[PDB]
Symmetry: D2
Subunit: 354 residues, 4 copies
């Protein structure tokens, strides 16, 4: 039979459609959602034709669910189990896994199937490929609002911290304090950073950035970002800069503010432009040892399990990211439009299913 | 005027106060007078176990915050009157080992360790710091003295255990031994993003500080073998890393038994007895379990101290909880030293505050 | 249904009969074109270094021809000439997501052939996950050099990988049997400048020089530690790779590596309860002498990269083969060469083709 | 008391007479036994690369004989024949402790010769921190090879070091000037399997093959991205080392490496506002294509490690030396060659011994 889902129809057009219910392969699971959350990624897919032009493709890639059914080879999950579903759900049997980059298993960024090559999570059911490798059990002591921050927001933000090569006591700059940037701040704290400098203006974000460990807040007003951060560091710069937002020009701010031998760690999706500019002089004319990394978030069962431990054992509380809680399935359209309209008091919305 | 009073080891087994010539600096050195000092168990091994051999009239101690008295003509960043954290390690910084990336072993194995070894320690009215510009860090006024004197050694050693452990975001970590060094390995594990931290120790004062610094489980090596309790705690999985910060040589076999394949054993504890540290063949995968074993003298130098000052300054770790005894008075050095020798059940770390 | 050479009991070997393997939907059945015996099967048979087994066909080093594939195999077809990895792991585990496929499902569990499944010393053998655990063999590589890729090349190279060799570093290789010889060439592939090889057999000493060793230390001629200290002018070595010896070679390796260097073991220790780490020369725990010890990487990607190193003439493993025999019967003879360890042996190869 | 070849102004060069340099207690005075010119000096002069200078002696690649030492110099005495490192940094700084001596005291401040100091193109020159920035030169290495060590060898090898080359990985080297040629050898030294060298000067193409290049790619036969993509059957390269080209070579490098691979720059980019990163081929910021660009390591240890690589015949840099001149006056001739290299020249050496 069929089922209901909130999809993208054409560029700039969304709505509800009705498709045949998904069925699992023997290694797969069919999940029904318990809490979902929309993303800026869904917006660039609709109002910018980012991943190309789809047609009746259900949106959303951050979900916590209850396993509805599992194929015959699924060993560690059974119907009724409550699970965190990672946003990345890669095919784990490729040479790219053997090379150590599961995010690109099968091609560049091919590990991200939800709302891309597959129907997303904004439905009554969705399909998880390789349940034993892409699902993790949700402890009862973690509320659905916090868990639904793990699949994408926590892992991307913590990945920026990881890529930053943060040594103990190093000063970190986080450029952008949306939900991803906020998690990059907590991840920097989770890496032994001393001083953490957050760049942003939204006061709900600025309050949350301090709560996640920021010691300084640089505003887009009050001066230019480069000069402000160099003044705070007394002309020394930062050891690492985690890019978590902006357009291509932020790449030059980060290269200008990190010291020689430091790291620029980007987790931002650059949606437009042919090139991202690296400033030649502040990159030491090519010889300043300022490493630039840019990475898609890790995913999979073990990645979620480790983030679940950080939430369980009280190392990070991702709930303060949730500024809007809706109840009920039909509120997915509301939360989606909230991510497009983006009021000043919004960080991340969550739809809890009845 | 030309002399100086200090607490010294007279010979193996005997300590006492002596008088000695004041040290003068070289062009790059500084003379520093103690503002606060702390004794270490390393000094107990040296006096009473001869761990480093015979010394006559050597002033002990190697953890000090102090005020600069005199600087050589080439010292650029430190003038008399400056309050400085003194790196416990004071390497010669122009050696091939520094270029190899191991300042701790500049000029020889453990040769960056000079205080109360090849040079008079900090338990005197004055002491010599070689290469002030590289081995001193400026002390913020916002940091109390008793908390700052934890940085030269206790903080940088415990943190080295966590750095060597290769901790990943959310990994499970076991800290073996929770004296002052193990307690700072617990905090360092938390700094590197450990999820579950399993602390191993018996004394209540250390167990309380272990939970303060981030331990989520306590294993008492009296309720049964450590390895059985930890294996049951992790339901057969083991731990991603085991930081060794105390115990006899047998603790190395315990660490190997509790870390999973691919995990790390990071030792920072000093072993003073026994010919061999046992690595069990079976639980080391007969040589192929990928259980890396590290063991390293603590990092020192100015950059090391500054980064740790920053961690205290920005409220990332409060080492003040390590200080169970604070004595005011230069001569309480001796009494604080004997605390380290006797080890009462409520002692973690003592601090002597000078005038 | 089929025959093969097997460990019957601890210390006891011989031929047995088995039901012919059938492949699961992701597996392949392979018949051997060429196999080789290992010292590791010796340690397992005549020492029970991992415990007892019953009716287990032996062997883990084989180049072969696929005879049957499963329903979901995509890149491998019946008739394909393949390099089979000694380690044939289940690639869908938590340990693979942690970066340790060698221990997928448990310590050393990536190692299935002649450990927990019937090996390659048989008319046929089972390969789990063909797409992930097989590599296509180019025509340009002969069988005798190709059957050194599954195990000797990957283990010896892994020792060089664990050693953290810097450009121009001085590296010591302890043991120059087949694994140590590939560790000498691995260190050469990692930019080692000076390479000191330790060993006794003249056939090994000669191949050690061929692969890159600049110096030879005969452990029977005198203490390794004194000889190496003389060669390096008391400075020691930057890294020491262990590819042979008894348990005490661990102390030798710690004593010859300088502070901050690495000890990289790839040797299978089969005897004794403990491996001794000498307390004094390990800096009493603080010398930064890192000790590693790992089972060789396996799988399709690992084999494809080693194939490239042979194809582009970066290493020639064919000099490891000192004995070649033909036919199933001679597997027995080649296995005893590994046990009897005669003085002109490095590695034997049995051609079935 | 000294004659040197110097930058008179922007655009003008010539022999001048300055006062003899005098050693600090830790520095040494050295006279050149053999020198080589660089293309950076061409930028420094004929392009105003580093502002203006007056009477600043040029050059920064020299093998020399120690003439004078300060009272604190322990390991070098007058008359010692030494390799002098191009990067002569202040080893007592914050950046040394952070692990970046190339930037000790500032961004690229480890560079002093023909920058903030009189270069090696003089009867004498000053080396700061002699014990830390000189290495003894064994008699076994000819002067022409040894002078290839201070810059060409250490820069080109650093590109391979930065590349994170795994054993058997496929590496591309963009540009086959002397730095690219050493980058090809460095990749061989890191265990690269297939090495795709990009360039077209016939002296450099023959030189690239000699150092391990398995493929050569000429811009004349098509675009670089398409040829390399076609050579790897669309798979790409595991690492690309940039050793030449305009700013847009950065875009060619991102396009040819697979996701998860590394672009490693060691090329001097002297023109343009930005170095371009092609957004789409960088995975819109998430393709895990790490970009590295680093100045060459310096110091006594780096030089000793590369001396061993030449001493033990791991690389022979002699092939970089296409032209050998004799006599001081010929310095200007050799320097002028770098302004516009003949299509048969890689690197020139002036012998003064
Ligand atoms: N399980 C796996 O998949 C796997 C994979 C690869 C290798 N391995 C293990 O790798 C190890 C090496 O294998 P192999 O075939 O190269 O071994 P091998 O043929 O026995 O060679 C051993 C080497 O060690 C030397 N040696 C022996 N005793 C010594 C001593 N006391 N001091 C110094 N050198 C000494 C030998 O010298 P002589 O010349 O005098 O004999 C020889 O050079 C084995 O333990 C093997 O099981 C395991
Ligand atoms: Zn998203
Ligand atoms: Zn101490
Ligand atoms: Zn084997
Ligand atoms: Zn140059």
């Amino acid at each position: 039979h069929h089922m209901k889902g909130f999809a993208m129809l054409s560029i700039g057009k969304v709505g509800w459609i009705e498709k045949e219910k998904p069925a699992p392969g023997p290694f797969d699971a069919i999940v029904r959602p318990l809490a979902v959350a929309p993303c800026t990624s869904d917006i660039h897919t609709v109002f910018e034709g980012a991943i190309g032009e789809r047609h009746n493709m259900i949106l959303g890639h951050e979900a916590v669910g209850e396993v509805v059914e599992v194929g015959s080879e699924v060993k560690d999950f059974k119907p009724g189990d409550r699970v965190v579903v990672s946003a990345l759900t890669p095919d784990w049997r490729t040479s790219e896994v053997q090379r150590g980059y599961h995010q690109h298993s099968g091609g560049m960024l091919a590990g991200w199937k939800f709302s891309n090559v597959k129907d997303g999570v904004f439905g009554e059911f969705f399909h998880v490929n390789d349940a034993d490798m892409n699902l993790a059990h949700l402890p009862k002591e973690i509320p659905l609002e916090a868990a639904v921050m793990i699949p994408d927001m926590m892992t991307t933000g913590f990945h920026g911290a990881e890529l930053a090569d943060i040594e103990l006591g190093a000063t970190v700059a986080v450029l952008g304090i949306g939900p991803v940037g906020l998690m990059a701040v907590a991840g920097a704290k989770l890496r032994g950073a001393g001083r953490i400098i957050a760049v942003g203006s939204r006061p709900v974000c600025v309050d949350a950035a301090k709560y996640y460990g920021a010691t300084d807040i640089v505003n887009y007003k009050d001066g230019p970002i480069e000069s402000q951060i160099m003044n705070l560091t007394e002309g020394k710069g930062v050891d690492a800069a985690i890019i978590a937002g902006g357009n291509a020009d932020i790449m030059a701010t980060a290269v200008k503010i990190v010291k020689p031998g430091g790291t620029i760690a980007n987790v931002n999706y650059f949606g437009e432009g042919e090139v991202l500019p690296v400033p030649r002089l502040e990159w030491g004319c090519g010889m300043a040892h300022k490493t630039i990394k840019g990475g898609l978030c890790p995913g999979g069962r073990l990645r979620m399990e480790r983030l679940i431990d950080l939430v369980f054992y009280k190392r990070v509380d991702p709930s303060k990211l949730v500024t809007h809680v809706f109840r009920g399935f039909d509120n997915i359209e509301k939360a989606f439009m909230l991510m497009k309209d983006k009021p000043k008091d919004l960080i991340k919305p969550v739809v809890i299913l009845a």
